[PDB]
Subunit: 258 residues, 3 copies
């Protein structure tokens, strides 16, 4: 709807900056914060509309902005719509984006409730000409052809694992390749088999577009899938929510800080 260029994103971010003094260093999109300011999307002009909230505050002694209310491609949201919040985070000061999502577990060693830290992704829609970055490149935010090298910051993944390991739930944590199915259908057994064989570990309908935008504008990304279902290969969340929440809090606690 509203082109996610520097002028429009600057407008939304400037507005939000009147609504709050909190300069978030960490962006959090969830698939508890202290001294919080809850800004409903409805309150934000030219900001995408789900009802969703942008929660600012402090988490493990860090300034965070939480996105409550997500914009999925399968809902029909445009590239710009989905990009805009992430680029706003950029202008607001977000240096690190932490994302959780629900995913089907393709990898046969995954179990319900497992955490699969994304170490890489296969952006099926992206490969198929539905990349969120298709269209004029917004040069203010990033380069025309972003590399997705170390897209899922290895250091953040290392830290997340350590945090999980140190807190006794290291057994739950895997790292894997997330493949995006544009959705909104769940994957057929044939699709899951194909996806597994493509070297995919978990499959979901979200996240990648945000990650691409985040990486495009230089926001480090941390992303974890919660395996909320085990993919069926042949045709013949609430639980782990507070664990994952605790995990995100603890990781943030140990995030480096300027």
């Amino acid at each position: 709807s509203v082109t996610a260029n520097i002028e429009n994103v600057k407008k939304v971010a400037h507005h939000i900056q009147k609504l709050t003094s909190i300069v978030p260093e960490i962006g959090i999109i969830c698939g508890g914060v202290k001294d919080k300011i809850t800004i409903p999307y409805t309150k934000i002009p030219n900001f995408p509309q789900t009802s969703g909230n942008l929660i600012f505050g402090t988490l493990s002694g860090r300034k965070v902005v939480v996105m409550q209310g997500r914009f999925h491609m399968y809902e029909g949201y445009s590239n710009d719509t989905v990009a805009l919040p992430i680029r706003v985070m950029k202008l607001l000061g977000v240096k690190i984006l932490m994302v959780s999502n629900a995913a089907g577990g393709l990898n046969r060693s995954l179990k319900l409730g497992d955490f699969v830290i994304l170490k890489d992704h296969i952006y099926l829609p992206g490969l198929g000409l539905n990349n969120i970055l298709v269209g004029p490149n917004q040069e203010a935010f990033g380069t025309r052809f972003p590399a997705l090298s170390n897209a899922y910051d290895r250091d953040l993944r290392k830290l997340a694992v350590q945090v999980a390991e140190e807190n006794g739930f290291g057994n739950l944590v895997h790292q894997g390749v997330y493949v995006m199915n544009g959705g909104p259908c769940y994957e057929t057994p044939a699709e899951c088999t194909m996806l597994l064989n493509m070297g995919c570990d978990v499959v979901g309908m979200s996240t990648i577009p945000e990650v691409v935008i985040a990486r495009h504008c230089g926001i480090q990304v941390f992303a974890v899938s919660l395996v909320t279902n085990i993919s069926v290969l042949d045709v013949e969340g609430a639980q782990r929510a507070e664990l994952m929440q605790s995990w995100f809090e603890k990781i943030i606690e140990k995030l480096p800080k300027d």
Copy 2:
């Protein structure tokens, strides 16, 4: 086009119900090989798409597709004569609307045929590949027919495609084929949709075959998705209208004429098969 939402679909459904007393229990999407089936419907009421306000318009070189009501083996059917292929540029709503209309009309089972290239090397020209599953390549991209606000009136936001190709219908179809002595023509496999309208390159065919795809076509899955989304049971058969070329060195090439020819040649048998499956469908 017009949104395949409940209001518009009701309008269309109601328009249709003014034009026929036939409450279809079975919807049939005339793909390759079914042209003759359409013609065999007893006591037809033929409703050109052009006579249905807000119904999607499609033509065969100028001639409007038709909705065909009547019976087939003693069962009330609506035959879609004229499908809306995504490669023609039809919208998700256009493709979805007729299936959702079928839902409101009383369709419980959707039978669809299509023409497909045989990726699976054991397939022969003229084989019937009952779809037991599919790989919705456009769907995996961001071109799933359900992309956009979900029409809650018709189904859930995230439909599972578990048993999309009803195993019981598949079993029945196989049994009917077996009983009638053409079981040997009958296979089951995975259909992968290539948005098209280009036939697959050999590299694409090799890739698709390695993905576990048995047949490849440009249709059907979106209809199936819409069908499943609204709880219509689906039976789908691919007619192997060509053997996919996996080798770039080959001089053989897919051409629609031969596809039509295989459809024409197998149409009688497929009609018979469908008619006989229909007669054995459970209940009434």
Copy 3:
């Protein structure tokens, strides 16, 4: 964007034919490694009504290796947001202008592990990921004046042109740089992730790029013979642990470094094309 139908294409072709009497038999789409034509007129896209606009881009007519050529300087990439019609029109204009053979280069990532930087990979086939996923440039009403509703893509990359290309490279001392392979299109504009590259490699892809296939599909649709070469402007990184990453500036540098060789090759290829 104007529909790439016969009427609109004709109009464009005609306005162009006002600006030049060079009837091109060879269309060249410059990608990496291209960018010599003699007796040339440079027609900026800006001077051509309804012709797509890109940065201006030029339609260059003239003589190359004795043959009438039209060189498309300024390409239309799907990742830029260009429509099918926009990408198709110029190829269809070429067709009307008289083009028989389309020679196209591009920059691509080297997936095939035997590939080296600056290698040439003649496309012998492709995987049109956007095309499989309903983003085929031909989606929409078929333009019957140009081609059939369901084009086959067999011999899409003319085996004879490929043979000639390889022979020309061989005898001109650089056959060692020349491979043939499968090109996969990534809609882009992101470079592939390591997981994507690994998947693409495993799909049987040798090189990956964000271009070419749409034009090739349109060229084949209207019966233009196609020769296409990927310059391996970067070795795809399959390892997520690796520090190595693609870099457009390096991609550009590699292309330019090979441009002269690519030019020579294309020229010597055009040199050996059958003259009727």
